[PDB]
Design a protein around this nucleic acid. Structure first.
Ligand SMILES: [Mg+2]
Ligand SMILES: [Mg+2]
Ligand SMILES: [Mg+2]
Ligand SMILES: [Mg+2]
Ligand SMILES: [Mg+2]
Ligand SMILES: [Mg+2]
Lengths: 45, 392, 117, 176, 73
RNA sequence: GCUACCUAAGAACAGCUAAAAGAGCACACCCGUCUAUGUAGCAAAAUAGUGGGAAGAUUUAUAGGUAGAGGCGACAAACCUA
RNA sequence: GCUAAACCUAGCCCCAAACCCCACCUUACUACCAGACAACCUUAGCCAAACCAUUUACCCAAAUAAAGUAUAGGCGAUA
């Protein structure tokens, strides 16, 4: 019954975790800054 | 109460920086940076000129500056105008007297069985069945498809009478023709910009139906008025317009004389379809507009009683219900409510068939109504054929 | 869920896949009805010379002598292109020598560069 | 014709094709602009033929005959491009004083880093461009801590590298 | 001493300036009074922004100077 | 991106009985009454049969919204990525 | 006798010194139309006080010393 909580959709993915949404708020900008500081290959989703 | 809430109204611009209020000093703005910064003054940008010039990025000038703008406001009737008072309003606007039923002159053209089409009912039934059931792979064709089809097939069926009537060779049904006619009514200038479709043009003008005595008898008839509804209601009040009378064709066009205007209300949705009264009003207005354009082209742009009245017919249909109109324009002196008046014979709500069953209704595994038209009325097609044959 | 693979036009739903391109430069615009109007001037016209009678070849003979690389400089170009005329007219308004005050008005403006390659 | 995409038919199947030398920058600097224009397409046709050979060799699972021809042609085209770029750069410096063909500016992005923002071409001015004004060319104060943290990460990497270099040098001295 | 203070009334303008005489400072300093650091940086950048002189002019001036020296010597 | 509720704009609902129905029987579909199996399983809640609803307060795809002392809740302290 | 077992530098730690082509904010890495929203605002709590309720050290701009002194403090933990 459970386990399939991920029902993928690229529209939702980009609108929820994308670069534009991350930059849309100061908190998300700090998210990107933390990922850059850590050296993440993928900064946003 | 004001319409449009503040939250939806355009936001007020932020207050100007106080630095702009100090006379002697030049504010330091981010204009030089070429991008916004929040700690510098907001520049005051001069309005940009080269913008609203490119064809794909064009802004039309204000209506006041347009070439045809006029302080006097015309009232235009176009194809998508729906008169509130309907036939009464159209009669007042066109200075017309209504006569119930088609005239005997045209009705007699189909009394003799020679004009009756061989296998007339069979062919008309096939036309109705093709339009309403057999037209497409879809089970139930929509009105947008079966109204033009029914009209065109009926016109072809009538045109088949070229055998008996060689005069039918001097006519042609043009499509997308557009006419424009302007005239005054009690200091109100009214225009009709008829677009519609299926103008049946003939090489010869239609014979007049009403005699001089009847035309003069129209003087006594009083033009019915409606209050407090102004006759202007539901007409597009426009200040941009052209007072030229356009018949829709360049000079020298063969088949110059309008014969029949085929107006069809083919909208799938009832609210997008004209009411029968409003359709009859539109027929009156378009027939009057075409007749008036013809009169202004022939006898000049002078308000006068026409020595030779101009006759224009019209058939307005929704695919099932038809309305037949013969309009005799016998005066271009429209401004006054007194004098000889134009006159229109109208036959209303002539239904070609009562209903059409695209699917066989089955109750308790028993077929009650078979597929096909029910209540077919050949009389309406007789009237249609009479209108087509008039003048031939 | 694939954060590492490159975002291309093969990935999203129909709107995404239609909207994203592959870097090809635009050739025109879209009008009503999604009809594409192609602008001729937007299409790169290849200026291909006539190679008939050309003597140069893709390769150079190894018998050619070695030389020292001397990258062209503004000073060298000025000396070899303007200095002779300047001297000849000084011994005897810089537009006469080739200088243009502004690039505006030229087809091939040097800055901001407005031509391909 | 399409035959220009392939070598001379006599060379088909030859294990080796004799080729000259790549054009050098100095050799090209002596040629006219028209001569460079024509040589560019000569080299382009040769490059297309060689790329066709390389792809067909991969398809047939055979070594490409004289693969150094492609390297020579690429070097020649790079030299020609560099020569033309040198001439254009000199002309631009003479007539405008600009060391760069494309306009740009040093700007601080939303992440506080200094970048060379290369300008783009627009039909409307920047203060009217809606998409441009969404882009932020300033860093708010919450970026300062991350700027310091990035600087210190760089400093740690540099210190590690320098210490490692010195230790390697000491090890070499002890060995010899 | 801007004449835009009450133009057409020089006596009143001079009276005002005399009243506030003690605060007068050089204009080169008054231009920078009360500017934030970012505003001052932008002001300095605008002051020192100059479209580069074409190297044509520099080389022409240098060549003319050299030719003058050669002619004199 | 589950789920709860909502917003926008969609879609589905055989056949029979009945006749404009939060109607009846019963497919698709939704659910989960009872039994059995399974119990590191096919499955971190499934399977088989049985059963309830099945033109509606229905089911459902898409996009959006409400965020933690908060949300949402036909209140089970239920649900808000096992 | 299998599985294994062993190895030494890859680098790292602490100091010192020294101040360190093109694309991409729209669905980022997307050649090319009407902007305007543009930032600023005491940390709290864990914890100690054997509960807890006032209270309970925290990049300071010369180390040492004055001195854990003067002071503060449910005058107590402590500061
Ligand atoms: Mg779902
Ligand atoms: Mg049913
Ligand atoms: Mg029911
Ligand atoms: Mg519920
Ligand atoms: Mg309860
Ligand atoms: Mg305690």
């Amino acid at each position: 019954a459970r386990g399939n909580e991920y029902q993928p959709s690229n529209i939702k993915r980009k609108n929820k975790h994308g670069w534009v949404r991350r930059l849309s708020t100061p908190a998300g900008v700090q998210v990107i800054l933390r990922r850059m500081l850590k050296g993440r290959k993928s900064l946003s989703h | 109460y004001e319409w449009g809430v503040r939250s939806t109204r355009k936001s007020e611009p932020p207050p100007l920086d106080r630095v702009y209020e100090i006379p002697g000093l030049e504010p330091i703005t981010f204009a030089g940076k070429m991008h916004f910064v929040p700690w510098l003054a907001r520049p005051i940008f001069p309005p940009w000129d080269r913008g609203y010039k490119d064809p794909r990025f064009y802004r039309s000038p204000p209506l006041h500056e347009h070439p045809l703008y006029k302080d006097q406001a015309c009232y235009i009737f176009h194809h998508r105008c729906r008169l509130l008072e309907g036939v009464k309003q159209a009669l007042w606007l066109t200075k017309t007297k209504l006569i119930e039923g088609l005239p005997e002159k045209v009705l007699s053209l189909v009394d003799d069985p020679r004009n009756h089409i061989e296998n007339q009912d069979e062919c008309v039934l096939n036309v109705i069945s093709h339009a309403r059931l057999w037209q497409t792979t879809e089970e139930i064709p929509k009105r947008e498809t079966y109204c033009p089809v029914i009209v065109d097939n009926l016109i072809q069926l009538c045109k088949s009478q070229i055998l008996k009537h060689p005069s039918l060779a001097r006519r042609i049904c043009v499509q997308n023709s557009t006419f424009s006619a302007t005239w005054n009514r009690e200091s109100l200038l009214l225009q009709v910009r008829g677009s519609g479709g299926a103008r049946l043009s003939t090489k010869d003008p239609l014979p007049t139906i009403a005699s001089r005595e009847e035309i003069e008898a129209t003087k006594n008839h009083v033009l019915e008025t409606f209050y407090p509804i102004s006759p202007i209601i539901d007409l597009h009040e426009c200040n941009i317009y052209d007072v030229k009378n356009d018949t829709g064709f360049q000079e020298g066009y063969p088949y110059p004389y309008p014969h029949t205007l085929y107006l069809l209300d083919k909208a799938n949705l009832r609210p997008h379809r004209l009411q029968p009264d409003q359709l009859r009003a539109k027929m009156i207005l378009f027939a009057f507009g075409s007749a008036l354009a013809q009169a202004r082209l022939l006898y000049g742009n002078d308000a006068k009683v026409l020595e030779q009245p101009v006759v224009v017919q019209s058939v307005g249909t929704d695919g099932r219900v038809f309305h037949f109109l013969v309009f005799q324009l016998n005066t271009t002196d429209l401004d006054c409510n007194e004098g000889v008046k134009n006159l229109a014979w109208v036959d209303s709500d002539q239904l070609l068939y009562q209903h059409f069953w695209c699917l066989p209704v089955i109750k308790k595994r028993v077929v009650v109504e078979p597929v096909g038209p029910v209540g077919f009325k050949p009389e309406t097609f007789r009237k249609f054929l009479a209108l087509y044959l008039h003048g031939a | 869920a694939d954060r590492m693979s490159k975002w291309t036009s093969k990935r999203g739903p129909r709107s995404f896949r239609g909207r994203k391109g592959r870097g090809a430069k635009g050739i025109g615009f879209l009008t009503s009805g999604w009809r594409f109007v192609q602008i001729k001037e937007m299409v790169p016209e290849f200026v291909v010379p006539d190679l008939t009678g050309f003597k140069l070849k893709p390769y150079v003979s190894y018998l050619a002598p070695e030389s020292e690389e001397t990258p062209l400089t503004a000073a060298q170009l000025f000396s070899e292109a303007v200095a002779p005329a300047i001297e000849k007219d000084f011994k005897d308004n810089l537009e006469k020598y080739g200088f243009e005050p502004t690039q505006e008005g030229k087809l091939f403006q040097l800055y901001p560069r407005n031509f391909l390659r | 014709g399409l035959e220009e995409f392939f070598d001379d038919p006599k060379n088909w199947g030859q294990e080796k094709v004799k080729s000259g030398a790549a054009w050098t920058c100095q050799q090209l600097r002596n040629k006219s602009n028209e001569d460079l224009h024509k040589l560019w397409y000569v080299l382009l046709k040769e490059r297309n033929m060689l790329l066709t050979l390389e792809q067909e060799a991969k398809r047939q699972r055979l070594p490409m005959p004289s693969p150094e021809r492609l390297d020579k042609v690429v070097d020649s085209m790079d030299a020609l491009d560099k020569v033309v770029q040198e001439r254009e750069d000199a002309l631009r410096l003479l007539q405008t004083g600009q060391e760069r063909a494309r306009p740009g500016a040093w700007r601080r992005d939303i992440f506080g880093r200094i970048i060379w923002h290369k300008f783009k071409q627009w039909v409307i001015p920047w203060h009217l461009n809606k998409r441009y004004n969404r882009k932020r060319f300033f860093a708010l104060p919450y970026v300062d801590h991350f700027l310091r943290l990035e600087r210190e990460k760089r400093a740690r990497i540099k210190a590690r590298k320098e210490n490692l270099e010195r230790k390697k040098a000491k090890i070499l001295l002890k060995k010899f | 001493q801007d004449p835009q203070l009450h133009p057409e009334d020089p006596e009143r303008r001079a009276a005002i300036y005399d009243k506030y005489k003690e605060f007068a400072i050089p204009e080169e300093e008054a231009e920078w009074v009360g500017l934030t650091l970012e505003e001052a940086i932008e002001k300095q950048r605008l002051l020192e922004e100059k479209d580069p002189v074409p190297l044509f002019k520099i080389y022409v001036a240098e060549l003319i100077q050299q030719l003058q020296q050669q002619a004199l010597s």
